[PDB]
From a paper:
LmTXNPx, cloned in the present study from the LmjF15.1140 gene, belongs to the Prx1/AhpC peroxiredoxins (Prx) subfamily, able to reduce H2O2, organic hydroperoxides and peroxynitrite thanks to redox-active cysteines. In particular, LmTXNPx is a typical 2-Cys Prx and forms an obligate homodimer, whose active sites are formed by the N-proximal peroxidatic cysteine (Cp) from one subunit and a C-proximal resolving cysteine from the other (Cr'). The structure of LmTXNPx was determined at 3.0 Å resolution. The crystal belongs to the space group C2221 and the asymmetric unit contains five protein molecules (A, B, C, D, E), modelled from residue 5 to 168 (4–169 in A), and 64 water molecules. The LmTXNPx subunits, as for LmTXN, are associated in homodimers (α2); however, they are arranged in a different way. In turn, LmTXNPx displays a decameric assembly both in the oxidized and in the reduced states. LmTXNPx was crystallized under reducing conditions which stabilizes the FF conformation. Interestingly, in all monomers of LmTXNPx the LU conformation appears to be predominant. In particular, both the locally unfolded (LU) and fully folded (FF) conformations, typical of the oxidized and reduced protein, respectively, are populated within the reported crystal structure obtained under reducing conditions. The B-factor analysis performed on the LmTXNPx structure shows that the mean B-value of the whole structure is 36 Å2 whereas the mean B value of the Cp loop (residues 49–54) is 60 Å2 for the A monomer and 45 Å2 for the B monomer, indicating a high mobility of the loop.
Numbering used by the authors:
A (entry chain E), B (entry chain D), C (entry chain C), D (entry chain B), E (entry chain E), H (entry chain B), ...: 5 to 168
F (entry chain A), G (entry chain A): 4 to 169
The structure:
Amino acid sequence: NAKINSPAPSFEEVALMPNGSFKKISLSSYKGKWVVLFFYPLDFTFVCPTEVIAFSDSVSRFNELNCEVLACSIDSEYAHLQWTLQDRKKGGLGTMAIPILADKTKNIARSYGVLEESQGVAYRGLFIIDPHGMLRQITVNDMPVGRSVEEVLRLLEAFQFVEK
Amino acid sequence: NAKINSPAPSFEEVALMPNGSFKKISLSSYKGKWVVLFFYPLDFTFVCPTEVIAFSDSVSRFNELNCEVLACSIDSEYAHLQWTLQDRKKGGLGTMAIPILADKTKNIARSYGVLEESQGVAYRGLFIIDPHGMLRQITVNDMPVGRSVEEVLRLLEAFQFVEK
Amino acid sequence: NAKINSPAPSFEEVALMPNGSFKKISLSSYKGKWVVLFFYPLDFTFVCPTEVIAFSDSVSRFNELNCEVLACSIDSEYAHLQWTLQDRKKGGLGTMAIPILADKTKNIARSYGVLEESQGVAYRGLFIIDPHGMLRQITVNDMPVGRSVEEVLRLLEAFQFVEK
Amino acid sequence: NAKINSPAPSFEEVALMPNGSFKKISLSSYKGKWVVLFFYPLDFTFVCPTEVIAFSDSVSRFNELNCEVLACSIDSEYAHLQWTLQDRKKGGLGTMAIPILADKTKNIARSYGVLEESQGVAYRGLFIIDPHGMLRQITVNDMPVGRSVEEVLRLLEAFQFVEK
Amino acid sequence: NAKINSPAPSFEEVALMPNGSFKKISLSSYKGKWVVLFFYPLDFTFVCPTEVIAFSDSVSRFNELNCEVLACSIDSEYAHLQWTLQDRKKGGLGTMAIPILADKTKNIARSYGVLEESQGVAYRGLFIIDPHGMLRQITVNDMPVGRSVEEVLRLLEAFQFVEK
Amino acid sequence: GNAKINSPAPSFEEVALMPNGSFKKISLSSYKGKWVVLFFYPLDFTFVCPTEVIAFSDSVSRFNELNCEVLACSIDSEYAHLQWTLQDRKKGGLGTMAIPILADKTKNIARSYGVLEESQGVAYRGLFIIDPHGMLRQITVNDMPVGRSVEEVLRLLEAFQFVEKH
Amino acid sequence: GNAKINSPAPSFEEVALMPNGSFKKISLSSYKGKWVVLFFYPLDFTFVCPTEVIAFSDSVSRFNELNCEVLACSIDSEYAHLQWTLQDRKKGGLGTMAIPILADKTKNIARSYGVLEESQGVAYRGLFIIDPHGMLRQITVNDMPVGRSVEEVLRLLEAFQFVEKH
Amino acid sequence: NAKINSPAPSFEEVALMPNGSFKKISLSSYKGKWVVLFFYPLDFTFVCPTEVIAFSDSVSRFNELNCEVLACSIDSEYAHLQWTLQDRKKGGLGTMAIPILADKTKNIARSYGVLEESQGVAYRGLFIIDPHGMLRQITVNDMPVGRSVEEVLRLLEAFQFVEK
Amino acid sequence: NAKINSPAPSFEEVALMPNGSFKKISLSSYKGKWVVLFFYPLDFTFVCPTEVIAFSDSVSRFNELNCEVLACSIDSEYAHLQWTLQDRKKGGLGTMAIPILADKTKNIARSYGVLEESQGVAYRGLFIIDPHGMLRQITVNDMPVGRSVEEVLRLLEAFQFVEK
Amino acid sequence: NAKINSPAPSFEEVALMPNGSFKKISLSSYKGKWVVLFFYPLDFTFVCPTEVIAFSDSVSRFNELNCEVLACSIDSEYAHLQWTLQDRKKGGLGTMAIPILADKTKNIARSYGVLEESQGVAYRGLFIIDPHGMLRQITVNDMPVGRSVEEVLRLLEAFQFVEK
């Protein structure tokens, strides 16, 4: 389970890459970089996916801070792909600048302790992981409330300021 | 688990209705009718979903034999809905004449013993259930091979013939 | 128990050979060939044995597809033999072109999960096993309904088409 | 398991009746009479079935002593029937003057502790049971050696002489 | 332990009141109001307690939203009191407009899963609890990075907007 | 009861009254290479005139010329057994014997052969045929009041040996 | 061993050879209201001339006039016991006895009194003094080859009864 | 615990020596000699200590038979000493010709199974041990009844006569 | 075991009364009074008994403060008695003004956690118990160092001052 | 736990040094010296901390007896520091001549068995430890009653006198 100042739970799982391909991604492959790993409940929700899009539209701000961003849900990689092929205007995801993990077994959500067991979907959890793979901050929102790109960046800069 | 001449495993779960709405469906609500419950692995797969469509195109042939047909997968109801909104020509599902269960918790697949745990997806299992809710026949295919609408009908007629 | 894409349960047991002799047969001796292993409840049933005969009459069609066929029941090898010595017109089996396993311990039925424990007899289960010894499809019928030689051949071609 | 001066293990099972019909028979239905229950391994064995026949040819001798005799094996009732329809001269059983239990589940053999677990067949066990349902004597032979009708009668008379 | 959409872990503990008195406070006494419960590591840290002060300076903004705010640490109520008697200029806490729980047994921190067991102090955890006592959002920061009053208010308004 | 057909007959090494009147330790394995008829009886000095035990003793040679040794057993001490043999046959005693009699003082032999009546502390009239390989080949158990047949055991022996030959 | 000083002596109900020659069930509790000397010995018909058991039988009245009953016990059957009494005293037998002899066929009595030699299946020369209330009051246990003293047991009895009085 | 023909329970403990000194004494130091080890309840009991004295007055009789005698109780060595300094006429012990063990831990009494647990004192137990350290006879008296020096000597001579 | 502000461990045990008689004394019989219960190792020690005597010589000072004093050791009541009959000049105890418990089972020492298990004797433990039977202070000395009557009185007054 | 004549429970913990710095201190670092380790409940209590001050004012008296003195409580090192910065006249601690352990995890209190679990604070326990690290005396007071510097010195001198 996920704990501050302990190594963030490991995973190696299929993800939809920004280019549209499927690829296995391990957490340890990010060693040497900061990582913002964030979960969302379901693809194709009647929610306007503004939240997932917001993070994708902002990758480079995180990148300038040596931070990679990674999305995740219990949906398949095909579901992910289909959502990106769908129009943003029509409620789709459109192009993504970040990978989206396909947590098909729900185990990543489980290890990060964000799985709603009765629904089989993940809460809006977000985790900041340092270059050493250490879990440094936990944010978990109930389904109906989104996270803030600004806030995560606030936190990132703060953490990096302390390291300097 | 699913055993011949034992009551078929119970379930009550959200499904995508033929009209496009979401609805809770219980197995017991079919008491008095035959049921063909069949699983498939994933929505939006790169296999043209001929198999699921074949069963939908043939409901009537089951229906006049006092048999209801029910599809199921580990995908969400929103995923299901999205697939039906997708054009059949374009590898989508198009309109569906049968309900599709959203086994988001994988428990239905588990109880029917068709779940591939490592994958998180169900095998191509099909189950014939009588008006008394008794499991009467088991078919399970490996992912790459489809089932036969003709065969299931053969079996149905055979079973009903034995009742007279 | 038996599972798709797991090695099919092992066995080494006495069988009635097509020539009329008794012989020990192991599953692994079929490595390199496809196998259709199928169970039936009892020898000498008041149910005419059209089903078992149908598979025997069709061996070559299976053989041409690099597939061996194997029958099985809880009856002794002597019971098997006696049934083949009985005239086909008289409700007997006649000369068989396939071996018939004598599952006297009922353990083969048990491992394939087709044993009706209260009766001590096997359900009409049929299993397709690949040249690697991997279980590839499961069919189980309630006692009163037979299987289809055509259907098994349909699946066999389908499976081989996927490899080629 | 079966113990001297304890109630003989209960059973209710299908048997081939002397007239050729199938019938459920319980041990307790013999209360008030002595019973010689005896097991044999298999129907249709290559060795002339003189032993089973010997007991059938002698029923009236047992009946004279208020004793009923009951045969048993792991074979089905249909196997039993078929053996009696077979000519005695030809290695068959001919019509029998005693019922033959069809211990399909093997449980009767198990409870009397005569089941060879590796073979799935019963040893040549014979049990004398009194009118009170109490087990009074145990005889168990290895497969290749038969029992003696004279001896069982010796024992019967001895037991009845003591109760006199 | 603390879970989204489950009742927030109960507590009744001594707290330093804004007026300077000690008082037992239970979580359930806030039923009917929103609660922001937030932990901090230690009193008298060489950190300028800007964070704890920031929340105190902002109580009325939370109050206008029907939300009460509650601070907590493993320090005694006397330690709390002493810190408030200390000058803000000298690194003290000065006057507080919010109560500060004295989690002397560390059990509140434990139940909210924010206790650093090796240090015996709590991480910078913050929890939003609804009028029904249900846990609605989790924020946990590593020691050196503070939380944002603005962000918590963002979240509060969002939650209340959904309820309307 | 450990006593199972086609399994090695339960082992034992115990004091026995020898035909000559001496006490001697006897193990089952010492009979390897010979058939053995091991038979139990309830008690020495019983009010049942001991014809059964005597019958087997009077017939040893018949067993012996079948390459079969015969061995009696009961829960009584070796001294009890000896006393019984010193007692006159006419007078309800045993007389001198042609077979050894095991003194199953711990009752464990009877236990391992599953013939011990636990409430009484005595053995049922159990008889066991053991082959030259030490394998248990046939089980006979009688309730107390009914005896076994020397003829029958010989019938069985010949039958078993006939199967070995052909 | 359940046998503890100032605890109720271990219960039993078992067949015994009565002084008159009959078999009878005897329970410990049937002696309530009397002192009891219960004593064990290893085996009937031993090559030890049975002076010890005889000594206690020859002295019953001495125990009796102390309101004390005496009871012998061994793992031998009641038939063994009877046979021994039918045997002539001169000839190494027991002769007719003035005390009952328990037939501890299941060995449980010896077990509960903690005097059973498990490897031999026989009891040590244990002797137990039990009061009218059924309470165990003294324990004597001898190795096989050494006998007990009738005088000593009487010494003990008088001592115990003297303490009751004054 | 102590058993006939098993090695007598070991001990090494302080004892009051006949000369008035304290000394550690082990059971094994008597190997090669017979030992009469005997327990008594308490020092300074209101009843004239004739029993302990009787054994002391008779040591040479035991010594003649290559037998050493050893007294024991739960009292301290100082208690023992004090009792011997007390005048025999006055209810005291006087100087003893045998050692008296000070079983302060109660463990010797425990291992010889003579400890009255509720009182914390030992029963009047006496044990005869051979030159090989084997326990050869057990005598245990209830508190109010003494043992006999004559009897123990009777036993000793008997045992030695047998080994002769 | 014994704990501050928990009821002091119960006991009912024989004690040597100041008048020279034996009497059962329970802790609860002191309810309504303060109690100083103190242990010492052994009677008749080569260590002059100044400590035990000091407390006896001072009873009244304790009594005036509504406090009873109680001595205890693992020695028998007869040992106690004998020590008091011994002349104080001669290393004896003399007439005592306090009762002395005879903890023959060592259980009182055990429950107060002052038993030296290897020696079977108690450490120089002293316990102050209030009128409610609550344990209020613990003093435990290693064998060679005595306690102070003054100190115990200092504590007693202090405790009573806090109630008044 | 803390037992007389057993090694005193080990610890290594942060302490406030007399100079005002924080430093890790282990018990074993005192090997070769006597140690008076004493606990108190809480910093900033409304009791004028005369007791802790009394020991600090007297270090020298311990020091010349080759004895180091060590204070301890469950409060943080920062709490300790703050209390020493507070004016003695104002109920503060003022300058301290002894180190004060910060038992933030309450484990030292636990191992010395002085912790009041419900409170989360330690009782007024004091422990004398010899140069060999052996626990030699235990004093435990209920919260409202203080210990005596004189008494501890009495004990120290007594212990050292026994060593010569």
